[PDB]
Amino acid sequence: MDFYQLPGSPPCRAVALTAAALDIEMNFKQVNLMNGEHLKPEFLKINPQHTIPTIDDNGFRLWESRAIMTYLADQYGKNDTLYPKDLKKRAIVNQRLYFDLCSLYKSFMDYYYPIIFMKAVKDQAKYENIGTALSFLDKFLEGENYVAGKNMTLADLSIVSTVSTLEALDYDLSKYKNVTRWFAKIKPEIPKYEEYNNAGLKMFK
Amino acid sequence: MDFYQLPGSPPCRAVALTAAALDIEMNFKQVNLMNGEHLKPEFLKINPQHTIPTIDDNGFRLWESRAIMTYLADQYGKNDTLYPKDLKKRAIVNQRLYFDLCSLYKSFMDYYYPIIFMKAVKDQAKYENIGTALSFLDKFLEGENYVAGKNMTLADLSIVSTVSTLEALDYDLSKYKNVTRWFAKIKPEIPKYEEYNNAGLKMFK
């Protein structure tokens, strides 16, 4: 399995953490210089034509990190808990994966990408949207050990790829007491968290 | 099964079309006046505390339309094709459902909701984002009868809930020749399309 990634992006780290949680080996490919001038057509035809991350699983090309994550869990997961077969529990993981993409990750990107990439002026309205997403996440975690069920699921891995990035960028999570509790307990439980997530956080920190 | 809905919203119509495609009966509940003054606490406790649409399936509460859709397909679908059990085909439906939410539906909402709701000034940048999403959809449909596989899937039902709304709002789809082809062939195939989708479109048209 080939894994086309940019080590910094939360979606890439979400997929990497999922593979680590499932004990799946992947051949990591870095697509940094893929948009550089004069890359051979033969190099550009292997370049994923859509978004990063992308996997190539014996010719099966799949982009969209959260679709990759649920594919990997079912195709290669030895047991249930990461993405339960039970339809109600699965629906809640799915629900939380959509929340992660449209509230948490979107708010993270909307605020930090103008700053980090374009060196632009901080948007105070966009900054508060992060807090709004975290307040929802904090409510999901009220009285709960995990974001989307009684065990760690894919939704924990996807959400932690962004929450860990917020903390690396010095966003204070303390007021979100359930998010802070969850983030502290989840890191030691995530297989190879340091290797596959904290490594990529360095560019931000 | 209770179905809390606003008949106009594309996500509600997506769920309604899914139930119709699966021959599932639901008890439709209208949450229009749910934010009106002086609704009894007993009425507000039955009100869904999160987003519309929401289902209540014998006490199982589920919001997020696309999570509802995949739950309904697996829990109540007699056969495979709408949401295939095959993991590669399922991954592509899932992928297209995320695209539908973050490109197609988001671009629709970003342009029309300021106008329709707030009577605001048209945003020319937001208008072009619809075209950008449709160009991607048109590329997915190149050489294809359906948006996410060889048969009609949930991704067709979710995408059509927004595309049909664009056409009701006089967005011209003709330049997207594959989107126009697909929309014309998909409407007669969708069980109860008129009853459950065109009815709700009237407020926009």
Short mmCIF file of C-alpha atoms in Angstrom, two decimals:
data_model
loop_
_atom_site.label_atom_id
_atom_site.label_comp_id
_atom_site.label_asym_id
_atom_site.label_seq_id
_atom_site.Cartn_x
_atom_site.Cartn_y
_atom_site.Cartn_z
CA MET A 1 0.00 0.00 0.00
CA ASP A 2 1.32 3.40 -1.05
CA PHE A 3 0.50 6.42 1.11
CA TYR A 4 0.88 9.82 -0.56
CA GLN A 5 1.22 12.43 2.15
CA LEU A 6 2.44 15.79 3.35
CA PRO A 7 3.73 15.01 6.87
CA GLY A 8 2.33 18.22 8.35
CA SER A 9 -1.33 18.04 7.30
CA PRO A 10 -3.74 16.78 9.98
CA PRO A 11 -5.62 14.57 7.47
CA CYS A 12 -2.38 12.81 6.54
CA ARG A 13 -1.57 12.25 10.20
CA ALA A 14 -5.10 10.97 10.82
CA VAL A 15 -4.55 8.30 8.16
CA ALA A 16 -1.06 7.49 9.47
CA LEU A 17 -2.42 7.08 13.00
CA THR A 18 -5.19 4.83 11.67
CA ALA A 19 -2.71 2.58 9.89
CA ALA A 20 -0.61 2.46 13.05
CA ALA A 21 -3.68 1.61 15.15
CA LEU A 22 -4.45 -1.25 12.76
CA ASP A 23 -0.83 -2.48 12.51
CA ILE A 24 -0.92 -1.77 8.75
CA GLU A 25 2.35 -1.14 6.95
CA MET A 26 2.26 1.51 4.23
CA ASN A 27 4.95 2.84 1.90
CA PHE A 28 5.04 6.55 2.67
CA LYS A 29 5.51 8.82 -0.37
CA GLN A 30 6.19 12.54 0.06
CA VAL A 31 4.48 14.80 -2.49
CA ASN A 32 6.20 18.03 -1.41
CA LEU A 33 7.99 18.84 -4.68
CA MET A 34 5.09 17.49 -6.81
CA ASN A 35 4.20 21.02 -7.99
CA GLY A 36 7.79 22.04 -8.75
CA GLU A 37 8.77 23.11 -12.23
CA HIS A 38 10.01 20.52 -14.77
CA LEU A 39 8.82 17.33 -13.03
CA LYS A 40 8.67 14.64 -15.77
CA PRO A 41 5.16 13.73 -17.14
CA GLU A 42 5.95 10.22 -15.91
CA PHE A 43 6.43 11.63 -12.40
CA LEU A 44 3.26 13.73 -12.68
CA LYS A 45 1.12 10.77 -13.84
CA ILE A 46 1.91 8.91 -10.61
CA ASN A 47 1.16 12.12 -8.68
CA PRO A 48 -2.36 11.85 -7.17
CA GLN A 49 -4.70 13.89 -9.36
CA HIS A 50 -6.93 14.78 -6.40
CA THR A 51 -6.26 15.70 -2.77
CA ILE A 52 -3.63 14.59 -0.26
CA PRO A 53 -3.74 12.13 1.51
CA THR A 54 -4.27 9.43 -1.10
CA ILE A 55 -3.65 5.71 -0.82
CA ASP A 56 -2.91 3.29 -3.62
CA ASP A 57 -3.94 -0.18 -2.40
CA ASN A 58 -2.78 -2.60 -5.11
CA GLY A 59 -4.12 -0.22 -7.74
CA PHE A 60 -7.16 0.96 -5.77
CA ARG A 61 -6.81 4.73 -5.49
CA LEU A 62 -8.64 6.40 -2.65
CA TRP A 63 -8.54 10.03 -1.55
CA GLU A 64 -10.49 11.77 1.25
CA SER A 65 -8.81 10.95 4.58
CA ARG A 66 -11.94 9.94 6.44
CA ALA A 67 -13.01 7.60 3.63
CA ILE A 68 -9.50 6.12 3.70
CA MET A 69 -9.79 5.68 7.46
CA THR A 70 -13.04 3.74 7.39
CA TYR A 71 -11.82 1.68 4.42
CA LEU A 72 -8.64 0.73 6.28
CA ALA A 73 -10.52 -0.12 9.47
CA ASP A 74 -12.91 -2.53 7.74
CA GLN A 75 -10.45 -4.00 5.22
CA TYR A 76 -7.56 -4.50 7.64
CA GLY A 77 -8.90 -4.16 11.19
CA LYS A 78 -8.59 -7.33 13.24
CA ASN A 79 -11.31 -6.39 15.70
CA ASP A 80 -14.39 -4.18 15.99
CA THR A 81 -13.74 -1.36 18.44
CA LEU A 82 -11.99 1.18 16.19
CA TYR A 83 -14.96 1.23 13.79
CA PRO A 84 -17.69 -0.99 15.23
CA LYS A 85 -19.77 -3.17 12.94
CA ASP A 86 -22.79 -2.39 15.13
CA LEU A 87 -24.84 -0.01 13.02
CA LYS A 88 -25.80 2.41 15.78
CA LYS A 89 -22.25 2.70 17.12
CA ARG A 90 -20.93 2.99 13.57
CA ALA A 91 -23.43 5.77 12.80
CA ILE A 92 -22.13 7.79 15.75
CA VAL A 93 -18.53 7.39 14.57
CA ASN A 94 -19.65 8.48 11.11
CA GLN A 95 -21.53 11.44 12.55
CA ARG A 96 -18.49 12.52 14.53
CA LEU A 97 -16.28 12.15 11.44
CA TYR A 98 -18.50 14.62 9.58
CA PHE A 99 -18.41 16.99 12.57
CA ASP A 100 -14.62 16.68 12.63
CA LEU A 101 -14.36 17.66 8.97
CA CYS A 102 -16.87 20.51 8.82
CA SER A 103 -16.49 22.12 12.24
CA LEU A 104 -13.16 21.17 13.77
CA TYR A 105 -10.84 20.78 10.77
CA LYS A 106 -12.56 23.50 8.75
CA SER A 107 -12.28 26.02 11.59
CA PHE A 108 -8.63 25.09 12.13
CA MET A 109 -7.87 25.59 8.43
CA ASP A 110 -9.89 28.80 8.08
CA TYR A 111 -7.88 30.52 10.80
CA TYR A 112 -4.35 29.14 10.52
CA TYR A 113 -3.91 28.59 6.78
CA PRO A 114 -4.14 32.31 5.86
CA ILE A 115 -1.62 32.99 8.63
CA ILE A 116 0.77 30.07 8.16
CA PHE A 117 0.68 29.96 4.36
CA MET A 118 -0.13 33.49 3.18
CA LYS A 119 1.35 35.37 6.20
CA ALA A 120 -2.05 37.09 6.41
CA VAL A 121 -3.75 39.13 9.16
CA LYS A 122 -5.36 37.08 11.96
CA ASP A 123 -9.17 36.91 11.52
CA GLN A 124 -10.80 37.33 14.92
CA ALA A 125 -14.09 35.91 13.65
CA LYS A 126 -12.35 32.82 12.29
CA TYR A 127 -10.47 32.41 15.58
CA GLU A 128 -13.72 32.22 17.54
CA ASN A 129 -15.04 29.53 15.18
CA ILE A 130 -12.34 27.22 16.54
CA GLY A 131 -13.72 27.85 20.01
CA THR A 132 -17.24 27.16 18.77
CA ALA A 133 -16.16 23.81 17.31
CA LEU A 134 -14.27 22.92 20.48
CA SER A 135 -17.29 23.79 22.61
CA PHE A 136 -19.30 21.23 20.62
CA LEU A 137 -16.48 18.70 20.98
CA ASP A 138 -16.35 19.43 24.69
CA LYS A 139 -20.09 18.74 24.92
CA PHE A 140 -19.70 15.41 23.08
CA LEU A 141 -17.03 14.45 25.63
CA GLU A 142 -19.10 15.36 28.71
CA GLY A 143 -19.10 12.22 30.85
CA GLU A 144 -17.27 10.24 28.15
CA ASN A 145 -13.81 8.70 27.78
CA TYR A 146 -13.88 8.98 23.97
CA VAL A 147 -15.41 11.22 21.33
CA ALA A 148 -17.75 8.74 19.64
CA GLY A 149 -18.43 5.74 21.85
CA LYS A 150 -17.19 3.65 24.77
CA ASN A 151 -13.83 2.84 23.14
CA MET A 152 -11.30 4.73 21.06
CA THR A 153 -12.57 4.95 17.47
CA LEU A 154 -11.49 6.44 14.17
CA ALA A 155 -13.22 9.62 15.27
CA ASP A 156 -10.70 9.97 18.13
CA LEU A 157 -7.82 9.58 15.68
CA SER A 158 -9.21 12.10 13.22
CA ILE A 159 -10.10 14.67 15.86
CA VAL A 160 -6.73 14.28 17.63
CA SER A 161 -4.91 15.07 14.39
CA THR A 162 -6.37 18.56 14.58
CA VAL A 163 -6.55 19.07 18.37
CA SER A 164 -2.88 18.12 18.74
CA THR A 165 -2.12 20.71 16.05
CA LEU A 166 -4.04 23.40 17.94
CA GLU A 167 -1.97 22.68 21.05
CA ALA A 168 1.25 22.72 19.02
CA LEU A 169 0.18 26.17 17.77
CA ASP A 170 -0.40 27.33 21.39
CA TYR A 171 -4.20 27.33 21.31
CA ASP A 172 -5.22 27.03 24.96
CA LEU A 173 -7.53 24.05 25.46
CA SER A 174 -7.83 24.34 29.25
CA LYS A 175 -11.29 25.93 29.28
CA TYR A 176 -12.48 22.89 27.32
CA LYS A 177 -11.98 20.66 30.33
CA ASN A 178 -13.34 17.57 28.63
CA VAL A 179 -11.22 18.16 25.51
CA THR A 180 -8.15 18.60 27.72
CA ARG A 181 -8.99 15.48 29.72
CA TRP A 182 -9.58 13.46 26.54
CA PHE A 183 -6.43 14.70 24.80
CA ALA A 184 -4.29 13.76 27.81
CA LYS A 185 -5.74 10.26 28.12
CA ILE A 186 -5.83 9.57 24.37
CA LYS A 187 -2.18 10.22 23.50
CA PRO A 188 -0.76 7.26 25.52
CA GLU A 189 -3.43 4.95 24.05
CA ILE A 190 -2.77 5.80 20.38
CA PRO A 191 -0.23 3.31 18.98
CA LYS A 192 2.89 5.08 17.68
CA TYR A 193 1.39 8.51 18.40
CA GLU A 194 4.81 10.15 18.70
CA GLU A 195 6.27 8.61 15.53
CA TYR A 196 3.31 9.33 13.26
CA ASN A 197 1.76 12.51 14.71
CA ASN A 198 4.18 14.57 16.83
CA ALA A 199 6.89 14.23 14.17
CA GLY A 200 4.72 16.07 11.64
CA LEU A 201 3.65 18.71 14.16
CA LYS A 202 7.17 20.17 14.29
CA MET A 203 6.69 22.52 11.32
CA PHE A 204 3.78 24.20 13.11
CA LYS A 205 5.28 24.32 16.64
CA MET B 1 -39.20 6.05 13.22
CA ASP B 2 -39.59 9.79 13.75
CA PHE B 3 -38.07 12.16 11.19
CA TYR B 4 -37.54 15.75 12.35
CA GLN B 5 -37.27 17.94 9.28
CA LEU B 6 -37.62 21.30 7.59
CA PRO B 7 -39.13 20.36 4.19
CA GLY B 8 -36.99 22.87 2.30
CA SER B 9 -33.48 21.92 3.43
CA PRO B 10 -31.51 19.72 1.01
CA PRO B 11 -30.21 17.49 3.84
CA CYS B 12 -33.77 16.76 4.95
CA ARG B 13 -34.77 15.91 1.40
CA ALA B 14 -31.69 13.70 1.04
CA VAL B 15 -32.85 11.66 4.04
CA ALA B 16 -36.45 11.59 2.80
CA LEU B 17 -35.30 10.34 -0.61
CA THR B 18 -33.17 7.68 1.08
CA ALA B 19 -36.11 6.41 3.12
CA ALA B 20 -38.23 6.37 -0.03
CA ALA B 21 -35.51 4.48 -1.93
CA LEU B 22 -35.45 1.89 0.87
CA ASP B 23 -39.26 1.66 1.22
CA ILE B 24 -38.93 2.86 4.83
CA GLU B 25 -41.89 4.56 6.47
CA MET B 26 -41.08 7.46 8.78
CA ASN B 27 -43.31 9.75 10.84
CA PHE B 28 -42.46 13.21 9.55
CA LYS B 29 -42.29 15.94 12.22
CA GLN B 30 -42.01 19.61 11.25
CA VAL B 31 -39.74 21.70 13.47
CA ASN B 32 -40.60 25.07 11.91
CA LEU B 33 -42.06 26.77 15.00
CA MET B 34 -39.56 25.05 17.35
CA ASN B 35 -37.79 28.38 18.02
CA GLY B 36 -40.98 30.37 18.57
CA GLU B 37 -41.60 32.14 21.84
CA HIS B 38 -43.41 30.35 24.70
CA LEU B 39 -43.10 26.74 23.46
CA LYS B 40 -43.58 24.52 26.56
CA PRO B 41 -40.38 22.96 28.11
CA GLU B 42 -42.06 19.62 27.38
CA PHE B 43 -42.24 20.59 23.70
CA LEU B 44 -38.63 21.83 23.73
CA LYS B 45 -37.29 18.63 25.35
CA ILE B 46 -38.59 16.59 22.40
CA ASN B 47 -37.09 19.18 20.05
CA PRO B 48 -33.77 17.82 18.65
CA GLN B 49 -30.95 19.50 20.57
CA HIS B 50 -28.63 19.35 17.56
CA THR B 51 -29.11 19.88 13.82
CA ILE B 52 -31.98 19.13 11.45
CA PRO B 53 -32.54 16.49 10.06
CA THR B 54 -32.66 14.15 13.04
CA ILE B 55 -34.20 10.71 13.28
CA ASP B 56 -35.48 8.98 16.39
CA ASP B 57 -35.39 5.23 15.70
CA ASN B 58 -37.07 3.59 18.70
CA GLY B 59 -35.12 5.91 20.99
CA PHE B 60 -31.92 5.99 18.93
CA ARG B 61 -31.32 9.64 18.10
CA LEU B 62 -29.17 10.37 15.08
CA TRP B 63 -28.37 13.71 13.47
CA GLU B 64 -26.10 14.47 10.48
CA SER B 65 -27.99 13.63 7.28
CA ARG B 66 -25.25 11.60 5.64
CA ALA B 67 -24.76 9.50 8.78
CA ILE B 68 -28.52 8.97 8.86
CA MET B 69 -28.43 7.93 5.21
CA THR B 70 -25.78 5.26 5.61
CA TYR B 71 -27.42 4.03 8.82
CA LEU B 72 -30.77 3.66 7.07
CA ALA B 73 -29.23 1.90 4.07
CA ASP B 74 -27.50 -0.76 6.17
CA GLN B 75 -30.20 -1.17 8.83
CA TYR B 76 -33.17 -1.27 6.45
CA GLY B 77 -31.85 -1.79 2.91
CA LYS B 78 -33.00 -5.04 1.34
CA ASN B 79 -30.17 -5.19 -1.18
CA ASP B 80 -26.63 -3.89 -1.73
CA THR B 81 -26.60 -1.39 -4.57
CA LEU B 82 -27.61 1.81 -2.74
CA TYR B 83 -24.67 1.45 -0.32
CA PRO B 84 -22.63 -1.57 -1.37
CA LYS B 85 -21.13 -3.85 1.24
CA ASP B 86 -18.05 -4.19 -0.98
CA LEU B 87 -15.42 -2.13 0.81
CA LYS B 88 -13.93 -0.45 -2.26
CA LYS B 89 -17.31 0.53 -3.69
CA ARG B 90 -18.45 1.65 -0.24
CA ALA B 91 -15.32 3.79 0.17
CA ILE B 92 -16.12 5.63 -3.07
CA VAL B 93 -19.67 6.33 -1.91
CA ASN B 94 -18.25 7.58 1.38
CA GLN B 95 -15.71 9.72 -0.44
CA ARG B 96 -18.41 11.24 -2.61
CA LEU B 97 -20.59 11.90 0.46
CA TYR B 98 -17.78 13.96 1.99
CA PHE B 99 -17.32 15.82 -1.32
CA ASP B 100 -21.07 16.48 -1.40
CA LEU B 101 -21.00 18.01 2.08
CA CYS B 102 -17.85 20.12 1.86
CA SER B 103 -17.87 21.27 -1.77
CA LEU B 104 -21.36 20.99 -3.20
CA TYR B 105 -23.65 21.63 -0.22
CA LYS B 106 -21.26 24.09 1.42
CA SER B 107 -20.95 26.16 -1.76
CA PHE B 108 -24.72 26.12 -2.23
CA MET B 109 -25.26 27.32 1.35
CA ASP B 110 -22.49 29.93 1.27
CA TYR B 111 -24.05 31.70 -1.71
CA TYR B 112 -27.80 31.31 -1.30
CA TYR B 113 -28.30 31.43 2.48
CA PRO B 114 -27.11 35.07 2.85
CA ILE B 115 -29.43 35.96 -0.03
CA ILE B 116 -32.47 33.83 0.81
CA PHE B 117 -32.34 34.25 4.59
CA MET B 118 -30.64 37.60 5.26
CA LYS B 119 -31.65 39.33 1.98
CA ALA B 120 -27.93 40.09 1.58
CA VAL B 121 -25.82 41.21 -1.40
CA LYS B 122 -24.84 38.44 -3.85
CA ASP B 123 -21.19 37.37 -3.31
CA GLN B 124 -19.57 36.88 -6.71
CA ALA B 125 -16.72 34.86 -5.19
CA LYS B 126 -19.17 32.55 -3.43
CA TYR B 127 -21.15 32.15 -6.66
CA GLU B 128 -18.09 30.87 -8.51
CA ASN B 129 -17.45 28.30 -5.77
CA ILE B 130 -20.67 26.58 -6.83
CA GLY B 131 -19.24 26.33 -10.33
CA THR B 132 -15.99 24.96 -8.93
CA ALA B 133 -17.85 22.24 -7.03
CA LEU B 134 -19.96 21.41 -10.07
CA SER B 135 -16.86 21.17 -12.25
CA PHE B 136 -15.53 18.50 -9.88
CA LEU B 137 -18.91 16.74 -9.91
CA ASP B 138 -18.92 16.94 -13.69
CA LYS B 139 -15.48 15.29 -13.75
CA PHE B 140 -16.67 12.47 -11.46
CA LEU B 141 -19.54 11.87 -13.89
CA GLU B 142 -17.37 11.77 -17.04
CA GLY B 143 -18.20 8.46 -18.70
CA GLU B 144 -20.43 7.42 -15.78
CA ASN B 145 -24.16 6.87 -15.26
CA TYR B 146 -23.95 7.68 -11.52
CA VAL B 147 -21.85 9.81 -9.21
CA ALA B 148 -20.18 7.09 -7.13
CA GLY B 149 -20.33 3.72 -8.88
CA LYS B 150 -22.11 1.62 -11.49
CA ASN B 151 -25.53 1.93 -9.82
CA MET B 152 -27.47 4.68 -8.08
CA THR B 153 -26.11 5.09 -4.54
CA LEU B 154 -26.72 7.25 -1.51
CA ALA B 155 -24.26 9.71 -3.03
CA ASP B 156 -26.65 10.27 -5.95
CA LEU B 157 -29.50 10.97 -3.52
CA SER B 158 -27.47 13.39 -1.42
CA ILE B 159 -26.01 15.24 -4.39
CA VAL B 160 -29.40 15.47 -6.15
CA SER B 161 -30.90 17.15 -3.09
CA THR B 162 -28.60 20.09 -3.76
CA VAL B 163 -28.38 19.99 -7.58
CA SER B 164 -32.17 19.95 -7.88
CA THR B 165 -32.20 23.01 -5.60
CA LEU B 166 -29.70 24.83 -7.81
CA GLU B 167 -31.93 24.21 -10.83
CA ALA B 168 -35.00 25.36 -8.89
CA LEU B 169 -33.07 28.57 -8.13
CA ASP B 170 -32.28 29.02 -11.87
CA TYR B 171 -28.61 28.06 -11.71
CA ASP B 172 -27.77 26.99 -15.27
CA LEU B 173 -26.30 23.48 -15.28
CA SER B 174 -26.01 23.14 -19.07
CA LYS B 175 -22.25 23.78 -19.27
CA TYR B 176 -21.84 20.85 -16.87
CA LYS B 177 -22.94 18.41 -19.54
CA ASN B 178 -22.38 15.35 -17.38
CA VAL B 179 -24.22 16.91 -14.42
CA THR B 180 -27.12 17.79 -16.73
CA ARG B 181 -27.13 14.30 -18.24
CA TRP B 182 -27.02 12.67 -14.80
CA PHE B 183 -29.72 14.91 -13.31
CA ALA B 184 -32.08 14.12 -16.19
CA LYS B 185 -31.57 10.37 -15.97
CA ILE B 186 -31.59 10.22 -12.16
CA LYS B 187 -34.94 11.90 -11.46
CA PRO B 188 -37.09 9.13 -13.05
CA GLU B 189 -35.07 6.46 -11.22
CA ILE B 190 -35.43 7.96 -7.72
CA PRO B 191 -38.50 6.43 -6.02
CA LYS B 192 -41.03 9.10 -5.06
CA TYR B 193 -38.72 11.90 -6.23
CA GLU B 194 -41.62 14.29 -6.83
CA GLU B 195 -43.36 13.64 -3.50
CA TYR B 196 -40.28 13.90 -1.30
CA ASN B 197 -38.00 16.35 -3.16
CA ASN B 198 -39.86 18.62 -5.60
CA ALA B 199 -42.52 19.37 -2.98
CA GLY B 200 -39.91 20.94 -0.69
CA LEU B 201 -38.25 22.84 -3.55
CA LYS B 202 -41.29 25.11 -3.95
CA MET B 203 -40.17 27.66 -1.35
CA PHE B 204 -36.96 28.27 -3.30
CA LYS B 205 -38.45 28.26 -6.84
#
